[PDB]
């Protein structure tokens, strides 16, 4: 029935991981446009009231360490937590400078049993990264689950690719920032993400010299384990 209690000294931390350059060994390309994404996200979440921090070109070790350390900080006076991942990816996994790490391992650090200071508080993860290579051609006394209160806002659906323009930046990120700027402070988290879904679904379409990737589409994917409505504002 209710909303998450937002009456805290601060909204929370917001770890932004901006992966742009990858080791030759990985063979992954230079994610041109990611800086534009990070800048836009940085400002949006700052406006939301988050204490934003941006890390860059992190190795799987740094990323894991980063999040582990964060989960060990004291979130008592925080309303929630937010992490944004901007990098290359494949189903269930995400790319570090030097390779690949399971997204599950990155987020587990915040389970209710491993970050008590965030129990009953929303832990958000926004992931801008491919989850495969499929393309969408489009058409015409209590106790709580250690795994509760997590929300994953994926840019794309399992198994599919994720689009971005080195100029404008990621579709999902472009969308997310728009809606957030316009309603971040008045709409419920699921409403916002749903509008983002529609946004990248209708207002975006691939366009490339190679016909293999021409006029392609994309639909984001939201996974919620939240137990209350979430509004970014007292």
């Amino acid at each position: 029935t209710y909303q998450y209690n937002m009456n805290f000294e601060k909204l929370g931390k917001c770890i932004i991981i901006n992966n742009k350059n990858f080791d030759k060994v990985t063979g992954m390309g230079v994610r041109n446009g990611t800086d534009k994404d990070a800048e836009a996200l940085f400002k949006c979440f700052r406006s939301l009231g988050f204490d934003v921090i941006v890390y860059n070109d992190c190795s799987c070790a740094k990323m894991q360490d980063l999040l582990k350390k964060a989960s060990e900080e004291d979130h008592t006076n925080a309303a929630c937590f937010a992490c944004i991942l901007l990098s290359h990816g494949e189903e269930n996994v995400i790319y570090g400078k030097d390779g690949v790490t399971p997204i599950k391992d990155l987020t587990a650090h915040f389970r209710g049993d491993r970050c008590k200071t965030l129990l009953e508080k929303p832990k958000l993860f926004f992931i801008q990264a491919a989850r495969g290579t499929e393309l969408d051609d489009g058409i015409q006394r209590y106790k709580i689950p250690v795994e509760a209160d997590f929300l994953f806002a994926y840019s794309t659906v399992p198994g599919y690719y994720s689009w971005r323009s080195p100029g404008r930046g990621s579709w999902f990120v472009q969308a997310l920032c728009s809606i957030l700027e316009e309603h971040g402070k008045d709409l419920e988290i699921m409403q916002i993400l749903t509008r983002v879904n529609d946004r990248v679904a209708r207002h975006f379409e691939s366009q490339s010299d190679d016909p293999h990737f021409h006029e392609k589409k994309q639909i984001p994917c939201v996974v919620s384990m939240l137990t209350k409505e979430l509004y970014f504002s007292q």
Binding site: G29, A130, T133, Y161, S165, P166, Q207, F213
Partner: peptide, 17 residues
């Protein structure tokens, strides 16, 4: 080989517009 799958595999496919 297929350069195309090579591009997606390395995530170099980008919307140019």
């Amino acid at each position: 080989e297929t350069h195309a799958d090579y591009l997606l595999r390395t995530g170099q496919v980008v919307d140019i517009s």
